[PDB]
């Protein structure tokens, strides 16, 4: 009855989870304070300055030694993640567990790594990195700032996550006392921030698509832009859809579509014959090839 | 007139207050201006029901000159402008700004 | 409104808009904006002067 019920009803969901959206920051590397800076209160007063005493969150790490490390989705505000991540610890730790995917389990010690199987483990970790980054860069509400440090452009206010707002736009820093951070941030170009352009199709509606600049690494950006490119590849116009449905019913039940603006639809519902052939063959390989298997079919 | 005088590229109106500092208003910013003017009028003349709200609640408040039109299948467009008649409050208001 | 503290007993300096530290003493012109963002320092290093 299980097989028969399975073969008879296709409305059993179990479809691949295609639509995943991120409203946070399209980055996978986190700037990290590794070695904290010392607090001086008797001698050498004034050599260091913390943004804490100004009630401000520094846009950059301010420890004695700072590092760039790979941490997937560390700023991923929004939808729930794919469910697999890559989180390297700072280089002051082992960071070996990230390379024991294969050929390690019963063989090497807990505190080692397999030097003879390095290539495979590295490849798999990169694969996990890639899969974890497959999201859609969703837009979010923009707004102008009425403060003094405005640049004339609107920015993306991360309501409920103010620390994101501080991190997103290093250009909006407030700089006293010319520290090494200040000596760099002071060179920031004024208007390289916030919304750059948008596609405003319907009056009073949310922009269908927007272009802006913010904190975002190139590699993750390249990944996600490919991901949407893939999604577009499996989408067709409603006219195609209705024609396909009509044909499937041997031109019985000839329905049609309304004619009006459909601004930002997306129907990833199609593929190529080669994929269909591939899946068909693969499905046959999965099942047994005896008379007891084709009978429910 | 009020919205036009706060976006320094907008619909053409005399601008006596341009000497004052003002960041150029976005679509959202102008809505607040539209609301305040709306409320002030309804308070002054004691009016119930909508008077000007649609301009603030939907679409871009940065209006220039209202117009309605219909499109014929033959590609012909029939458009009817509705330029307002001579206002009186606007004149004295501009005078108040100038002085 | 960045100031530049200096070691070895040299008294501090202020960043000219040409991006060159200058001595505090003398004459200065403050746009409203820089004051609004650097009042905390101004209250401690310029105002006393």
């Amino acid at each position: 009855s299980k097989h028969l019920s399975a073969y008879l009803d296709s409305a059993v969901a179990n479809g691949p989870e295609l639509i995943v959206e991120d409203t946070g920051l399209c980055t996978s590397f986190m700037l990290l304070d590794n070695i904290p800076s010392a607090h001086l209160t008797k001698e050498l007063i004034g050599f260091t300055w913390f943004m804490q005493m100004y009630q401000m969150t520094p846009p950059l790490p301010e420890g004695a030694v700072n590092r760039i490390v790979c941490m997937t989705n560390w700023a991923s505000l929004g939808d729930e993640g794919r469910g697999l991540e890559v989180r390297l610890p700072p280089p002051t730790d082992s960071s070996v567990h990230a390379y024991k995917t294969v050929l390690s389990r019963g063989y090497i010690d807990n505190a080692q790594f397999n030097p003879l199987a390095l290539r495979s483990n590295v490849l798999l970790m990169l694969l996990q990195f890639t899969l974890s980054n497959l999201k859609i860069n969703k837009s979010s509400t923009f707004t102008s700032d009425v403060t003094t440090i405005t640049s004339g452009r609107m920015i993306r206010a991360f309501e409920g996550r103010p620390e994101l707002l501080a991190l997103a736009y290093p250009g909006r820093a407030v700089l006293p006392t010319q520290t090494k951070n200040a000596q760099f941030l002071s060179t920031a170009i004024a208007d390289r921030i916030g919304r750059l352009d948008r596609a405003n199709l319907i009056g009073g509606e949310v922009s269908a698509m927007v272009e802006c600049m913010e904190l975002c690494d190139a590699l993750t950006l390249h990944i996600r832009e490919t991901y949407v490119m893939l999604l577009r590849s499996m989408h067709q116009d409603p006219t195609q859809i209705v024609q396909i449905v009509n044909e499937c019913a041997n031109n019985l039940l000839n329905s049609t579509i309304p004619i009006s603006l459909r601004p930002t639809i997306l129907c990833p519902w199609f593929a190529s014959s080669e994929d269909l052939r591939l899946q068909q063959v693969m499905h046959l390989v999965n099942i047994s090839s005896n008379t007891a298997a084709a009978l429910p079919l | 007139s009020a919205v036009a005088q706060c976006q320094d590229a907008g619909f053409l109106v005399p601008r006596p207050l341009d000497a004052l500092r003002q960041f150029d208003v976005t679509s959202a910013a102008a809505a607040e201006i539209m609301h305040a003017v709306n409320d002030a009028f309804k308070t002054a003349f004691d009016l119930d029901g909508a008077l000007l709200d649609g301009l603030a609640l939907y679409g871009d408040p940065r209006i220039a000159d209202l117009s309605a039109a219909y499109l014929q299948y033959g590609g012909n467009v029939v458009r009817e402008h509705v330029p307002p008649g001579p206002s009186h409050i606007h004149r004295t208001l501009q005078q108040v700004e100038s002085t | 409104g960045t100031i530049v503290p200096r070691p070895d007993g040299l008294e501090p300096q202020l960043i000219d808009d040409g991006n060159v530290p200058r001595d505090i003493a003398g004459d200065w012109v403050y746009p409203s904006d820089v004051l609004q963002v650097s009042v905390a320092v101004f209250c401690d290093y310029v105002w006393p002067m």
Partner: peptide, 30 residues
Amino acid sequence: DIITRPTSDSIAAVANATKPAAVVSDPQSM
């Protein structure tokens, strides 16, 4: 009374996010 209305939350959020302290206690203040 005079008319006022609150700004939109997004405006307020950004404004409140940037408010450095007016007076800061440091040992070197002339």
